[PDB]
Amino acid sequence: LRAAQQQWGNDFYKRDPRIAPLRGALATYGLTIDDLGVASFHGTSTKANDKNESATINEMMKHLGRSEGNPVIGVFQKFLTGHPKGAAGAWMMNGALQILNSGIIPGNRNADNVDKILEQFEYVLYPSKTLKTDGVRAVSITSFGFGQKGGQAIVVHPDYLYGAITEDRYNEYVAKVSAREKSAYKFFHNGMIYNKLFVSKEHAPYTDELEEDVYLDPLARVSKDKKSGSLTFNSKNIQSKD
Amino acid sequence: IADEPVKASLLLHVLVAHKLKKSLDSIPMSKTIKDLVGGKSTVQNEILGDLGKEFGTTPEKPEETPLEELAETFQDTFSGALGKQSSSLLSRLISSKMPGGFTITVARKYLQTRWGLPSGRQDGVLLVALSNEPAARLGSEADAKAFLDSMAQKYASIVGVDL
Amino acid sequence: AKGSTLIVVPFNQGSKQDVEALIEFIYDTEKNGGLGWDLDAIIPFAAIPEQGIELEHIDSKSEFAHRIMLTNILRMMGCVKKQKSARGIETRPAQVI
Amino acid sequence: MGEPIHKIATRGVMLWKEFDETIFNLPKNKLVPTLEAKRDYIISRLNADFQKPWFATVNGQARDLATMTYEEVAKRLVELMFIRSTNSWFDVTWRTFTGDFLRRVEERFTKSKTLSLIQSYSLLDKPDEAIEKVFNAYPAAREQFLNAQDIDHFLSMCQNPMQKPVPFVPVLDRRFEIFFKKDSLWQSEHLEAVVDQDVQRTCILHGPVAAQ
Amino acid sequence: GVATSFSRKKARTFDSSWNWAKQSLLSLYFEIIHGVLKNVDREVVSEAINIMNRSNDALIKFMEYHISNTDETKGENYQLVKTLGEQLIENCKQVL
Amino acid sequence: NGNSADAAYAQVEIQPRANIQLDFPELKPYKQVKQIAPAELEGLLDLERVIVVTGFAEVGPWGSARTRWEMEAFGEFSLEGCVEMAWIMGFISYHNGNLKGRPYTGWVDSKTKEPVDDKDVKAKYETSILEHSGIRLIEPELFNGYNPEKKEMIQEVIVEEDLEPFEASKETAEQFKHQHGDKVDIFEIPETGEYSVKLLKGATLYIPKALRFDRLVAGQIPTGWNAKTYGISDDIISQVDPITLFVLVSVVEAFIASGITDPYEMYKYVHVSEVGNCSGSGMGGVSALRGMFKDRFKDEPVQNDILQESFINTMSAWVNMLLISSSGPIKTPVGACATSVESVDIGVETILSGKARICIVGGYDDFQEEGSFEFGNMKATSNTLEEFEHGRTPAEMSRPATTTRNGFMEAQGAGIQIIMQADLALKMGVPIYGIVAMAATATDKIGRSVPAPGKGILTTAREHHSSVKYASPNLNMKYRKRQL
Numbered sequence A: 001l002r003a004a005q006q007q008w009g010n011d012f013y014k015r016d017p018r019i020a021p022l023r024g025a026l027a028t029y030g031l032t033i034d035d036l037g038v039a040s041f042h043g044t045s046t047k048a049n050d051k052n053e054s055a056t057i058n059e060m061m062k063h064l065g066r067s068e069g070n071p072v073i074g075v076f077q078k079f080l081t082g083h084p085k086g087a088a089g090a091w092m093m094n095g096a097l098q099i100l101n102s103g104i105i106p107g108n109r110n111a112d113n114v115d116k117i118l119e120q121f122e123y124v125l126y127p128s129k130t131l132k133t134d135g136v137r138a139v140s141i142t143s144f145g146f147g148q149k150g151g152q153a154i155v156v157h158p159d160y161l162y163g164a165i166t167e168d169r170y171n172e173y174v175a176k177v178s179a180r181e182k183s184a185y186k187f188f189h190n191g192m193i194y195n196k197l198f199v200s201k202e203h204a205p206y207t208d209e210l211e212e213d214v215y216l217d218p219l220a221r222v223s224k225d226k227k228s229g230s231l232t233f234n235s236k237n238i239q240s241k242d
Numbered sequence B: 001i002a003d004e005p006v007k008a009s010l011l012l013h014v015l016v017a018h019k020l021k022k023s024l025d026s027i028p029m030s031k032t033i034k035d036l037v038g039g040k041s042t043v044q045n046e047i048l049g050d051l052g053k054e055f056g057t058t059p060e061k062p063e064e065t066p067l068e069e070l071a072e073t074f075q076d077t078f079s080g081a082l083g084k085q086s087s088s089l090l091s092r093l094i095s096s097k098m099p100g101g102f103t104i105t106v107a108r109k110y111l112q113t114r115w116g117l118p119s120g121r122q123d124g125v126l127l128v129a130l131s132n133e134p135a136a137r138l139g140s141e142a143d144a145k146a147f148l149d150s151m152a153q154k155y156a157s158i159v160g161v162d163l
Numbered sequence C: 001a002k003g004s005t006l007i008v009v010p011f012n013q014g015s016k017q018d019v020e021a022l023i024e025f026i027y028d029t030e031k032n033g034g035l036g037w038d039l040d041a042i043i044p045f046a047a048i049p050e051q052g053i054e055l056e057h058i059d060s061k062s063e064f065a066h067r068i069m070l071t072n073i074l075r076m077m078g079c080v081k082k083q084k085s086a087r088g089i090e091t092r093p094a095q096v097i
Numbered sequence D: 001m002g003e004p005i006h007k008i009a010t011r012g013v014m015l016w017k018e019f020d021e022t023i024f025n026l027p028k029n030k031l032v033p034t035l036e037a038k039r040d041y042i043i044s045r046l047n048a049d050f051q052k053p054w055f056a057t058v059n060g061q062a063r064d065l066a067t068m069t070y071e072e073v074a075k076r077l078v079e080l081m082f083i084r085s086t087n088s089w090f091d092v093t094w095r096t097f098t099g100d101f102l103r104r105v106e107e108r109f110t111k112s113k114t115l116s117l118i119q120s121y122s123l124l125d126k127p128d129e130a131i132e133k134v135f136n137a138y139p140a141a142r143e144q145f146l147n148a149q150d151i152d153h154f155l156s157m158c159q160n161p162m163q164k165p166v167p168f169v170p171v172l173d174r175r176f177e178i179f180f181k182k183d184s185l186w187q188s189e190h191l192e193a194v195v196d197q198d199v200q201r202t203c204i205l206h207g208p209v210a211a212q
Numbered sequence E: 001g002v003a004t005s006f007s008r009k010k011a012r013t014f015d016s017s018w019n020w021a022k023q024s025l026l027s028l029y030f031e032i033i034h035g036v037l038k039n040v041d042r043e044v045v046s047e048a049i050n051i052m053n054r055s056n057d058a059l060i061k062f063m064e065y066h067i068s069n070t071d072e073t074k075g076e077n078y079q080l081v082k083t084l085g086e087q088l089i090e091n092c093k094q095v096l
Numbered sequence F: 001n002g003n004s005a006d007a008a009y010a011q012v013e014i015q016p017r018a019n020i021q022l023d024f025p026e027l028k029p030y031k032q033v034k035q036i037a038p039a040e041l042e043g044l045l046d047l048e049r050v051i052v053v054t055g056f057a058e059v060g061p062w063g064s065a066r067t068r069w070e071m072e073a074f075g076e077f078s079l080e081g082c083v084e085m086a087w088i089m090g091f092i093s094y095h096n097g098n099l100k101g102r103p104y105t106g107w108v109d110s111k112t113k114e115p116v117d118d119k120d121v122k123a124k125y126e127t128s129i130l131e132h133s134g135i136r137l138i139e140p141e142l143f144n145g146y147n148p149e150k151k152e153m154i155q156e157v158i159v160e161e162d163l164e165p166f167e168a169s170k171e172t173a174e175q176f177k178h179q180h181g182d183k184v185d186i187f188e189i190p191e192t193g194e195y196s197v198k199l200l201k202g203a204t205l206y207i208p209k210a211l212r213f214d215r216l217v218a219g220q221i222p223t224g225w226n227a228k229t230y231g232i233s234d235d236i237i238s239q240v241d242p243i244t245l246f247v248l249v250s251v252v253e254a255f256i257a258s259g260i261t262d263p264y265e266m267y268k269y270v271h272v273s274e275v276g277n278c279s280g281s282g283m284g285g286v287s288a289l290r291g292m293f294k295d296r297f298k299d300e301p302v303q304n305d306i307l308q309e310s311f312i313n314t315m316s317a318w319v320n321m322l323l324i325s326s327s328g329p330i331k332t333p334v335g336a337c338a339t340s341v342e343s344v345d346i347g348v349e350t351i352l353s354g355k356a357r358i359c360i361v362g363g364y365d366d367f368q369e370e371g372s373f374e375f376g377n378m379k380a381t382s383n384t385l386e387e388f389e390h391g392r393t394p395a396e397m398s399r400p401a402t403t404t405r406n407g408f409m410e411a412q413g414a415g416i417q418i419i420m421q422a423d424l425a426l427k428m429g430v431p432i433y434g435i436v437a438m439a440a441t442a443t444d445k446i447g448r449s450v451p452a453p454g455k456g457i458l459t460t461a462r463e464h465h466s467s468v469k470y471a472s473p474n475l476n477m478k479y480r481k482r483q484l
């Protein structure tokens, strides 16, 4: 079943040379190149980078036949943070998920005057102030490291997942998240005021006598220990027929 | 004042306190090595390697026995000599900190003249100085005298004498 | 709007040297470091408030405000005239509001 | 203070005697480790047998303060402190407690400086309508557990000395014996203010020999 | 008072009206959808004037897309932005 | 009419207190959420092969992902954001107990211990918060007294006339002798047992001198940030490189954003071998490198294990050793400015190969003196003295896509995401912030400039268009559902 859903659901394009990896990733969930709303740019503030990035996005969108007049909205998060090297994309990825979940597209408050050279790129738009949209269905994240490391990621609005499961699975999910979100808030505030958000583990969830037995059983799971209250591996739940 | 060679109980306490970057009282005497550094397997064998040079002979399983016990086990053979590692540390303490012209000689001569402490007690004051490294560089001669003052009191308090 | 430009420059209208420098900048070519313009209007609305200064309290602030609001407006018009007449421009007068 | 008292041996007093033998005789170092170990047992006995039940107990299910919503707590205060039979607050101080807590709910869930919906605690003399009012203005406080700052505030409103001791045990900590034992004699004259009106929850002083 | 402030290197230029036009349209488009600007606000007519004044081919295409792909059945606001939008496109084609 | 007539006239004012939310994604009713996807999607996707983000965090110049978003999106803090920043920067602490006789429960100034109402926090601290956050002048106190206005170097000078003797130990003096050879004379002082060191004409000294460096600004973590404030112990803080503390906080703060307060909860659902770590760094622990290349040279007291704290893979090791305890994949990438996107590709391919089901991905990097100086000699960073000549304050120096852009604005921090199979996220009931539809890396082409950006990533749109008259049935979701 899984290998059939993969063949027709997830991986239908991997072999077909008439479907771009960028088109197929969005096609998976019924989106079109036109549904990619926001491009989180590496946008370092260097002359060579910011042109090259815009040119690259523009030629991707030109190829995949992104409709004229539907530019991607460039987000340039590094006007605020600066460039943290390794972390650069992790910050961009965080901003992208905040964009998808909020529908707000933050503006480059340092975009005094957009470079005239960038006007040649009809498929990008460089906003200077925050736009509250009606929704972003997808964000692109591009990085250009030193050493020819170039990278792109696409992040799709999570609401496209939930159309692939039953109402019963969705409502079972909704109830567990709701519960978890409450326990999470409880932990967070407690930990904040008692400077104990981070709690180092003293011990592994297994004793050194069980270490080798847990590693070698793929079905070993932790369970609540009645005395200590901490999740550990019980000897009863290791090479168990249950 | 009467001259008394340095107790193994003091020297050891200092060599341990020094290599954990932790004040002299912060570590209690009635506790094992393997308790204090229970995490890191490297810092343990590095403390054992340093006590091995300082005193000489080492008993079997020294990191499972409280320092109080091990202090007395060393005390019998130990004849109030600074040895290799503690000397090396006191040299570095004087050279890395201290103002210009303040050599260990001039710091010994100041403990003799002012506080009347002889060679055996001088050693002990300097070992207390080494536990309370000021992590800077004493800028003026006066600021250093004051430091050796404050270390002499802290030596007098732990040994039990008067000035 | 389309074709519009806004150059923003820090500027002291109390400073003779600033006045000369600002006009030299506006008229100098883009190669020399300028704008390569030729003014079609000058609207010198710079001013400082003088409040509760009667004849007997006329001092430094008022002598400075008089420089901003008269003397240097004349030096601004002078500097524009001196730049336009050096370039032989006799057919494009700047309108001074 | 460790003085012997002759009481009728009700389930409530028999609990008291059992906690004298097993918990309150233990030294201060061993007390907290024994309360966290026996938590589930202690709570199920307080709730079944004693005149001061475990506060955090929503529809018979044992919780903790941290796992209760602001609504659930406001409702639990009115259950334990407001007498439906007389249609009144057993003590004016308990009303002040419940009002202080509804004002704290407003403070937490409002986005801007505003007027309290409880202007006089005199409005709490109809306490359902006052709850429904506050939690209809702040519907988020029905679906959110207590902030950790609001548990600490609640527990510090329970220690308030210029107020009648609360008719419940709010937490199992070092002060458990003071919560359990303080203000224990009034409940036998006022069984309307005890959980199921159950005498067997209460402490009644009475001599063995004069009982004849 | 007579201390110089002027320097050529501190001159900031602002000439990227080609970009701000699309921003000014999109901010209007969403301000109408979220019901911040109504059909009785003069801010809508002020904004229309400032878009017409920056009208070029690129900006016309950008509107055609954004308005032609508005679903007028999502609300009275989505109808109002589709109506005004179509009018603003005609206005921007006339003053090109 | 008395004070009783105008006492019940006046009303009671409720002042807002900060109720900080975790901003979990808003789950719509099933009927609303079935209208955005096509109808055919139900039962089409293999949810073990769909990667979702369940949690994210960061440590950056604007504190957390929550604070950074407030300032990125709205340009100003809410009450919640101002309190969170005040807490982070250590301006306020929580107090519960006796404060000057009364029982107080709430925030207090961390220096004075005086109560602080939540309404007051913005008046009392916002100026100090905004002054000590984001891109600002480099603060020496945060970088081991590093001051770009006074950058220490040493010049080698041949000695022209013999120095006055100085006293050293016997060990130190033999060390000077071994080095300088017959250009130093060491002699025992018999009285004491110390040694006199005399450097003769022709010997080599190093005289300190300072360089004025022209990169004065950076994107620093807010002044007052401390791993202790999140609960990291003194023994960990003393052991690890600072960059490790950013990662440790980011990793817990991300698990909280996922609703996973105890990481061992994961092992109720997955084997210990199915929790990955795919996060990495461009340079790693550069404070440890400075330790082993410079401080060790200067015979300064450096810890002996400093090498292990340098290694890029060591930050991910400390996360495993203190929080996760997994035996799952550990693929640490080094992608310079693309590390974090490379990490997401490695994390996706690791989950899609069934080698893991949960993967921590992200990036971290520190700012230090040496890197700042070397990005300056490459002319990659903005020259801050040229920025001042143009009237630019620090907070307008990073200005992408602008006419006048002139280099990047170095910064430090970490960012972490937890990715997992969507099947497993729905089972665990963790929030789902996004689906990772694609992730790809790409090199460029034959060149000779390592820092030149290229167009290689353009390959992700690669498509054959010789024969595109008739739409392929493979792109139609109805044809694909029919074949399933």
Ligand SMILES: NC(=O)c1ccc[n+]([C@@H]2O[C@H](COP(=O)([O-])OP(=O)(O)OC[C@H]3O[C@@H](n4cnc5c(N)ncnc54)[C@H](OP(=O)(O)O)[C@@H]3O)[C@@H](O)[C@H]2O)c1
Pocket: D091, D161, D162, D163, D164, D165, D181, D182, D183, D184, D185, D205
């Ligand atoms: N000899 C005997 O046979 C005998 C028999 C029964 C009782 N007693 C004695 O009588 C006293 C009371 O007995 P108990 O069992 O009730 O002891 P208890 O629980 O220790 O005393 C009640 C406490 O509750 C507080 N309190 C109660 N109602 C209050 C209200 N409406 N407003 C404000 N505060 C209130 C008082 O605290 P504050 O002081 O902080 O206001 C008081 O100290 C004890 O001292 C006890 O020794 C003796």
